[PDB]
From Swiss-Prot, chain A:
Name of the featured protein: Transcription initiation factor TFIID subunit 1
Included range, full protein: 363 to 532 of 1893
Organism encoding this protein: Homo sapiens
Lineage summary: Eukaryota, Metazoa, Chordata, Craniata, Vertebrata
Protein's job: The TFIID basal transcription factor complex plays a major role in the initiation of RNA polymerase II (Pol II)-dependent transcription. TFIID recognizes and binds promoters with or without a TATA box via its subunit TBP, a TATA-box-binding protein, and promotes assembly of the pre-initiation complex (PIC). The TFIID complex consists of TBP and TBP-associated factors (TAFs), including TAF1, TAF2, TAF3, TAF4, TAF5, TAF6, TAF7, TAF8, TAF9, TAF10, TAF11, TAF12 and TAF13. TAF1 is the largest component and core scaffold of the TFIID complex, involved in nucleating complex assembly.
Disease note: Dystonia 3, torsion, X-linked: An X-linked dystonia-parkinsonism disorder. Dystonia is defined by the presence of sustained involuntary muscle contractions, often leading to abnormal postures. DYT3 is characterized by severe progressive torsion dystonia followed by parkinsonism. It has a well-defined pathology of extensive neuronal loss and mosaic gliosis in the striatum (caudate nucleus and putamen) which appears to resemble that in Huntington disease.
Family listed: Belongs to the TAF1 family.
UniProt subunit comment: Component of the TFIID basal transcription factor complex, composed of TATA-box-binding protein TBP, and a number of TBP-associated factors (TAFs), including TAF1, TAF2, TAF3, TAF4, TAF5, TAF6, TAF7, TAF8, TAF9, TAF10, TAF11, TAF12 and TAF13. Interacts with TAF7; the interaction is direct. TAF1, when part of the TFIID complex, interacts with C-terminus of TP53. (Microbial infection) Interacts with SV40 Large T antigen.
Curated annotation (Swiss-Prot), chain B:
Protein name per its UniProtKB record: Transcription initiation factor TFIID subunit 6
Keyword vocabulary terms for this entry: Apoptosis, Disease variant, Intellectual disability, Isopeptide bond, Methylation, Nucleus, Phosphoprotein, Transcription, Transcription regulation, Ubl conjugation
Task of the protein: The TFIID basal transcription factor complex plays a major role in the initiation of RNA polymerase II (Pol II)-dependent transcription. TFIID recognizes and binds promoters with or without a TATA box via its subunit TBP, a TATA-box-binding protein, and promotes assembly of the pre-initiation complex (PIC). The TFIID complex consists of TBP and TBP-associated factors (TAFs), including TAF1, TAF2, TAF3, TAF4, TAF5, TAF6, TAF7, TAF8, TAF9, TAF10, TAF11, TAF12 and TAF13. The TFIID complex structure can be divided into 3 modules TFIID-A, TFIID-B, and TFIID-C.
Keyword Nucleus appears in the UniProt entry: yes
GO cellular component labels: cytosol; MLL1 complex; nucleoplasm; nucleus; protein-containing complex; SAGA complex; SLIK (SAGA-like) complex; transcription factor TFIID complex
Gene: TAF6
Modified residues (Phosphothreonine): T107, T179
Highest taxon of the lineage: Eukaryota
Any GO molecular function: DNA binding
Phosphoserine: modified positions: S195
Localization: Nucleus
Protein family per UniProt: Belongs to the TAF6 family.
UniProtKB/Swiss-Prot annotation, chain C:
Any single GO BP term: regulation of transcription by RNA polymerase II
Any one annotated GO CC term: cytosol
Cellular location(s): Nucleus
In-chain residues carrying the UniProt-annotated modification Phosphoserine: S51
Disease entry from the Swiss-Prot or TrEMBL record: Alazami-Yuan syndrome: An autosomal recessive syndrome reminiscent of Cornelia de Lange syndrome and characterized by delayed psychomotor development with intellectual disability, hypotonia, microcephaly, short stature, poor speech, and dysmorphic features.
Modified residues annotated as Phosphotyrosine in this record: Y40
Family: Belongs to the TAF6 family.
MF annotations from Gene Ontology: aryl hydrocarbon receptor binding; DNA binding; protein heterodimerization activity; RNA polymerase II general transcription initiation factor activity; transcription coactivator activity
Organism annotation: Homo sapiens (Human)
Assigned keywords, A-Z: Apoptosis, Disease variant, Intellectual disability, Isopeptide bond, Methylation, Nucleus, Phosphoprotein, Transcription, Transcription regulation, Ubl conjugation
Function summary: The TFIID basal transcription factor complex plays a major role in the initiation of RNA polymerase II (Pol II)-dependent transcription. TFIID recognizes and binds promoters with or without a TATA box via its subunit TBP, a TATA-box-binding protein, and promotes assembly of the pre-initiation complex (PIC). The TFIID complex consists of TBP and TBP-associated factors (TAFs), including TAF1, TAF2, TAF3, TAF4, TAF5, TAF6, TAF7, TAF8, TAF9, TAF10, TAF11, TAF12 and TAF13. The TFIID complex structure can be divided into 3 modules TFIID-A, TFIID-B, and TFIID-C.
Name assigned to this protein: Transcription initiation factor TFIID subunit 6
Residue numbers of Phosphothreonine PTMs: T35
Length: 91, 404, 211
């Protein structure tokens, strides 16, 4: 309740504490990549940064709210997790 | 077996007027002997461990029941042919039932296959099955990359070998790309390295960097294990770029490699047409871009020549339906380059290459749909571009066909 | 971890400037969000604020505060210094909620939920142009949600409007291979427009907006 989004919590007043085939959607069949072709243009550590595991792996699609009234999964308040993999954060 | 087949056999032998109970008596006796042998030929199939029931199993099942695996002929004296089999009769239902006796002599005999050899490999290493080609295969925690450090070191070695400092290193790295089974789950990083490379490698037209990357694409494609059409949306642009772009370096000489690079791009386009094909997405999209490259006003010789090659290598019908209504424009372009008072440019070289390629394609396009009559001056109805030399190319193609 | 008082005060002033007291402070707050160099360490707070505020639309169907939150997202995207790759999984379903939800209005007939539709559709086309990678599969997973919301019947005309708006802001080849097969659905639409059992209902304005 007192963390980031406390303003929203206080405003609420809560106080505890075949066209669906996979290929159709591959971006080779949905992108004008012909425009990209450049006509007349004028290991101690990984060299690729560790990607966000949640974006790469998690099903964030399950936090989309398709219908406000009939929402299939009961959602819960989210705690701040301060990922330390990201640089630019002191801790 | 049906009894109406047993009366046909009886009356075609001289035994006429057989009763139905006489005829039913034949078809339960012989249907038992077929069932007795096929149950007995399944013993040789289970003991020869092939679950196939080959043609030789019935030859041993017959010999086991003291019947000659003699097929199609029966020797009442047994002395000429004993229980050794003759391998059956190679006969069909849809056969011709009459052949010429010199047709069987003049056909080439099939190749005797390789003899049996003993190779060893590893089903399991201390419990784990290796992925060799002989086998079927609050702070959030600090995550690990999805590649191992052996895999990441392998990627670094293969990419630093594929930039072609040494040729034997390249060739192995290309074969390693062409047949590594575990090269999936590293394929995003290879596709990104290719795509990103060509785009910052056409900023300065570095031909080797590009010829090595196109060979890397070709080595990525013929690998049978990996799934490529998730990554072809990055591949298509780079391979097509190796065809429709201007050359920032010395364009006139290495243009020979440049022409070769354009041919490689055309081959990549042909591969794109061949695999990964669904309705109206890939082949028609690159065909439309090639045609609007062609109909483009004042098209560059570099871009013009590359697009000409790309539309040329698309197969049998594509040049049959597309290159036809455009000969006059090609001739006019050639005439303008010729009338130039200046060769201090690459226009003349581009024109000569384009004309030669178009003339060779037109030659078989003609050899393919029409007889070789009036090969002297009838081509003057098509502006007289290749004419008698085109006729000579058609004659060489006819000689190759005769050799075949 | 905890925000220092400086950036705690900056977070408070910037979030309360985009709640609707006046327009000029809102424009200066959005021009602050779009053009400051050091707003990292306050990006998770802004993402949480935006996603929870779009969720709070279900208790109070406020069109205006949703337009303000979508202009907050559009200002967050224009910042060159901060990288929204680690927080895009929160902002994608918020803009999606502004697109394909059915009641975006308090008074459905007069509120132009329609603009928060095409604005958020342009926003999600930008968010899957800048961030879609073959490891992400953002654009394919957004097209699949829009497609199975459009092809499936029983969907309201507002959510079909949102689906068609997003699919048509993605590009030309998407409307070639998604919209053009179901053009016969226009007949099913004109079933309820040129005729229509009920006339004084609210289906007609949404249907000819879709048209």
């Amino acid at each position: 309740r007192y963390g980031p989004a406390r303003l929203w919590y206080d405003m609420l007043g809560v106080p505890e504490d075949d066209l669906l085939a996979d290929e159709n959607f591959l971006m080779v069949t949905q992108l004008h990549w012909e425009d990209d072709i450049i006509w007349d243009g004028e290991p101690w550590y990984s060299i690729f940064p560790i990607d966000n595991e949640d974006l790469v792996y998690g099903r964030w699609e399950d936090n989309i709210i398709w219908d406000a009234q009939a929402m299939p999964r009961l959602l819960e308040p989210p705690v701040l997790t301060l990922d330390p993999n990201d640089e630019n954060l002191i801790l | 077996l049906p009894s109406e087949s047993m009366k046909v056999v009886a009356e075609s032998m001289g035994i006429a007027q057989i009763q139905e109970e006489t005829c039913q008596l034949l078809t339960d006796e012989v249907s038992y002997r077929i069932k007795e042998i096929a149950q007995d030929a399944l013993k040789f199939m289970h003991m020869g461990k092939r679950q196939k029931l080959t043609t030789s199993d019935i030859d041993y099942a017959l010999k086991l029941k003291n019947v000659e695996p003699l097929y199609g002929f029966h020797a009442q004296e047994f002395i000429p042919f004993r229980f050794a089999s003759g391998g059956g009769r190679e006969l069909y239902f849809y056969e011709e039932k009459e052949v010429d006796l010199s047709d069987i002599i003049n056909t080439p005999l099939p190749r005797v296959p390789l003899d049996v050899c003993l190779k060893a490999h590893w089903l399991s290493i201390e419990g784990c099955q290796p992925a060799i080609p002989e086998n079927p295969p609050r702070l959030k925690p600090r995550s690990i990359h999805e590649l191992s450090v052996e895999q990441q070191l392998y990627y670094k070695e293969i990419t630093e070998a594929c930039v072609g400092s040494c040729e034997a290193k390249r060739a192995e790295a290309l074969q390693s790309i062409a047949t590594d089974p575990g090269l999936y789950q590293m394929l995003p990083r290879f596709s990104t390295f290719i795509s990103e490379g060509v785009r910052v490698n056409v900023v300065q037209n570095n031909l080797a960097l590009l010829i090595y990357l196109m060979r890397m694409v070709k080595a990525l494609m013929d690998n049978p294990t990996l799934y490529l059409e998730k990554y072809v949306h990055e591949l298509i642009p780079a391979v097509m770029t190796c065809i429709v772009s201007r050359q920032l370096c010395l364009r006139p000489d290495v243009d020979n490699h440049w022409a070769l690079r354009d041919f490689a791009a055309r081959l990549v386009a042909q591969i794109c047409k061949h695999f990964s094909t669904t309705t109206n997405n890939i082949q028609s999209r690159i065909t439309k871009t090639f045609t609007k490259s062609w109909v483009d006003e004042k098209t560059p010789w570099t871009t013009r020549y590359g697009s000409i090659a790309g539309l040329a290598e698309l197969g049998h019908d594509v040049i049959k339906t597309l290159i036809l209504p455009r000969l006059q424009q090609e001739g006019e372009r050639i005439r303008s380059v010729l009338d130039g008072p200046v060769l201090s440019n690459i226009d003349r070289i581009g024109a000569d290459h384009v004309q030669s390629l178009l003339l060779k394609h037109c030659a078989p396009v003609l050899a393919k749909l029409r007889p070789p009559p009036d090969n002297q001056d009838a081509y003057r109805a098509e502006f007289g571009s290749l004419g008698p030399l085109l006729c000579s190319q058609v004659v060489k193609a006819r000689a190759q066909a005769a050799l075949q």
